[PDB]
Amino acid sequence: PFQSTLWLLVGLSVHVVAVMLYLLDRFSPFGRFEDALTLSSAMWFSWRV
Amino acid sequence: TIGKAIWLLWGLVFNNSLPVQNPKGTTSKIMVSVWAFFAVIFLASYTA
Numbered sequence: 001p002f003q004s005t006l007w008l009l010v011g012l013s014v015h016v017v018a019v020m021l022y023l024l025d026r027f028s029p030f031g032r033f034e035d036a037l038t039l040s041s042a043m044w045f046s047w048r049v
Numbered sequence: 050t051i052g053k054a055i056w057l058l059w060g061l062v063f064n065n066s067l068p069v070q071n072p073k074g075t076t077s078k079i080m081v082s083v084w085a086f087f088a089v090i091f092l093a094s095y096t097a
Contacts, residue, residue: 048066049067
C-alpha cells in the first residue's frame with residue numbers, strides 16, 4: 001500500500017538520529033579506520049529503540 | 050532518581066525499549082509492574 005520512499009524516509013530518520021547522537025556530544029573526527037565507536041554504538045541505540 | 054525515573058517510565062510506556070536498570074525495594078517493583086500493565090493497556094487501546 002505504500003511506496004518504498006516511505007521506508008526510505010524511515011531510514012533517513014535513522015541517519016538523522018544517528019548523526020544527531022554524534023552531534024550532541026564532542027568526540028574526534030574519524031575517517032581513519034574502518035569501525036568507529038560512538039557511531040556504531042549510536043547505530044546500535046537507534047536499532048535498539 | 051527523577052532523571053532516571055522519567056526515562057524508565059518512558060521505557061515502560063513504549064514497550065520495554067531499554068531495560069535501563071531496576072532498584073531494590075519491592076514497592077518500586079510493584080509500582081513498575083502496575084505502570085507496565087497500564088502501559089500495555091494504553092498501548093492496546095491506542096492500537097485498537
